[PDB]
Design a protein around this ligand. Structure first.
Ligand SMILES: O=C(O)[C@@H](CO)OP(=O)(O)O
Ligand SMILES: O=C(O)[C@@H](CO)OP(=O)(O)O
Ligand SMILES: [Mg+2]
Ligand SMILES: [Mg+2]
Lengths: 419, 424
């Protein structure tokens, strides 16, 4: 009944127009689970690896026909007859079939698609919504969203060294209210940024990327857009940053350097502005800097390891022991399977850290991360600006989940933060 | 078993981040149909009217709680127990329950939401895909897409006048190939534009909106992008345009970056000349909203070799369409599901144009969603053409993805419209 009958994959397009894999897993019950796999950066590196074609006569080598073939043949022959209700066993069967430590044989994209589609197929067989099937009876916490509003850096026309500037509606009584708050402030930002010498176009996440005079100015625009929309900073709306320092050395504020100096810069911002979170505040492998950044403001700021931890258990366990950070950014496709993602979410959580579930550049109509964040009571999500279906779909799923929980639903609010 | 047991609505967000209505229709079988309504007015008019809250303390008055209540209360009470498999009768029930000729009491958005969700609930009950449930056994034609790749006029800081420039992969053997062709060209145009000093922007469709100097420049940049991508203009790729001349119309039209005006007859001559210079197969709103005299003349001069699509001119209005059919005003109509307000009436407008030799072009709206109904509607009615924008934002791409799934599912039965979509 929950035993796999057929596993089918196809090549579809992501939110950038780039090819991506969609996997359909059909059970004996006749229930089908469908999943679209994201894609972003960077690699090859040492995150799980996606199987791309390299055929220059199709989509400039970005085709995923080999990953589709690894599902329709290799994964399908090996998993037909497997019980889809047994997620942990299915994922270790996928990892076993691949044999490589970074999913390079079958592809991280082929493995994750099956991994996620099998969970959805089974959830529909038990007639359960995904968050409930994944996290059990206690899955009820709606996350405070990290809503992108302003960009910066490479796209691009030139902006402050910084990369992403996000808002967080902590003070809201529900996700529905918090969503309205950020959407209002996103539109109110344009009633300040527009008619001043800028466009209304968007990027890959829906946010904007204008030109700025100083590094202190984007914060001043956001803080104005908050009270202009009628919201109180700190108490209701709080700032979350992703400077993504790995790509850069402030070029140019006049001060470029130094691992110890950089930590001192962030301490000033938090003292005058309501910053609750800082993501990739130091480089990919600058382990010495992270430890200092933690000891300085870790008890008043959230420090998120994105490129620093790359959704890896080995370096997450290393940063837990070293006390290098207090938050990890969870990218489903960076690890390659559901079980391994759930494993990394729990490890961070049970070490007093927070798991921030995130989307990527190449998104889809797929809303798994909205059900994964409620299933694990993660308390936070990073799924982009309130402006593109690749991002809005996730916010809509959170609205459906909140409504479906009824009186059981609880919005994380300030309780999402471990200060 | 296909009898409606529950009808519930909620306020979700569209691709612009504005509130929109989502309707769920649950049948006695336990099957649920879900539909999101795309947006959407509230360019009076002669169309169906959507219900917005006007409460400025929520989403700047753009809330949709009133339309949600008209569903959760008025429509649910009236339609619980109605057979969802009877589409026409259901839509007649929604139209009668409203009582207004423009769906202003309940809201066009509440009516469309239920009309669409009931069809999906029913398709799931018969265990059929939507296109099959809607158009029957002969629903198999995959459309040639009108892919938005360049933007101008309004969304133009100051350069350019017209509004949108699209490419159509007429020469492809399948929708899968045609979508790749357009994707490759759009990306090649992203290279061409950056290798000129501009950036890679994307208004709500996904198309690039640069500040250009001449009216020909967007068409030239497109010809270069088609060629550098490795495709042949005319034979493989054709240009479809929506200048939306209502936006630049005392008068006789006004071309800001060309320093001209002239007569509707001269504005026709402008299109006659441009069509001789570029592989333009289709032109949408070549003349303004109510220039019925101009439209009739534009048909006489180009209607034998160019598709003339009425959008703001016909506004998915069956009375205006019947007038234009007789008056010989156009030869194609842009079909907006939410401008008419119901599925039955959309099917009626598509059929009226189809019989009588016109083409029905199914279109998306500026504020779209994850909802992919128009992909199933274009196949169900074998329309042959779709207008779903650039191959970029998921609001657009979701529809392309649904068409890929439809083409795969049909297998040997699937047929891409190709050049047969046209009357050139
Ligand atoms: O940092 C992130 O969360 C994402 C942005 O969507 O980056 P990328 O997808 O490029 O890894
Ligand atoms: O015509 C269209 O395709 C869209 C995009 O501009 O406009 P509207 O909002 O009128 O649907
Ligand atoms: Mg990051
Ligand atoms: Mg138009």
């Amino acid at each position: 009944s929950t035993l796999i009958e057929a596993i089918v994959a196809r090549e579809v397009l992501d939110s950038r127009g780039n090819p991506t894999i969609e996997v359909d897993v059909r059970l004996e019950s006749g229930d089908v689970g469908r999943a679209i796999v994201p894609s972003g950066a960077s690699t090859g590196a040492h995150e799980a690896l996606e199987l791309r074609d390299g055929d220059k006569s199709r989509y400039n080598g970005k085709g995923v026909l080999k990953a589709v073939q690894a599902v329709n043949e290799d994964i399908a022959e090996a998993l037909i007859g497997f019980d889809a209700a047994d997620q942990i066993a299915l994922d270790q069967e996928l990892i076993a079939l691949d044999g490589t430590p970074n999913k390079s044989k079958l592809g991280a994209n082929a493995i994750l698609g099956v991994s996620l589609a099998a969970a959805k197929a089974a959830a529909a067989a038990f007639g359960l919504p995904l968050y409930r099937y994944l996290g059990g009876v206690y899955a009820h916490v709606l996350p405070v969203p990290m809503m992108n509003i302003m960009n910066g850096g490479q796209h691009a026309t030139n902006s402050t060294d910084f990369q992403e500037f996000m808002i967080m509606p902590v003070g809201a009584e529900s996700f529905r209210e918090g969503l309205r708050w950020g959407a209002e402030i996103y539109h109110m930002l344009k009633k300040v940024i527009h008619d001043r010498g800028f466009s209304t176009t968007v990027g890959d996440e829906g946010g904007f990327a204008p030109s700025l005079p100083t590094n202190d100015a984007p914060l001043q625009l956001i803080m104005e857009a908050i009270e202009k929309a009628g919201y109180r900073p700190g108490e209701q709306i709080v700032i979350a940053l992703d400077p993504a320092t790995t790509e850069i050395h402030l070029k140019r504020e006049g001060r470029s350097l130094s691992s110890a100096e950089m930590v001192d810069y962030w301490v000033d911002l938090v003292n005058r502005y309501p910053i609750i979170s800082l993501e990739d505040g130091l480089a990919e492998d600058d382990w010495e800097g992270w430890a200092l950044l933690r000891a300085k403001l870790g008890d008043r700021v959230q420090l998120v390891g994105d490129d620093f931890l790359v959704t890896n258990v080995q370096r997450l366990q290393r940063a837990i022991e070293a006390k290098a950070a207090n938050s990890i950014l969870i990218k489903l496709n960076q690890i390659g399977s559901l079980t391994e993602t759930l494993s990394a979410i729990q490890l961070a959580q049970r070490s007093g850290w927070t798991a921030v579930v995130s989307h990527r550049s190449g998104e889809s109509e797929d809303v798994t991360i909205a059900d994964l964040v409620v299933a694990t009571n993660a308390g936070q999500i990073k799924t982009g600006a309130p402006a593109r279906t690749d991002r809005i779909a996730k916010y809509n799923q959170l609205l459906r989940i909140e409504e479906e929980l009824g009186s059981a639903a609880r919005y994380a609010g300030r309780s999402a933060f471990k200060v």
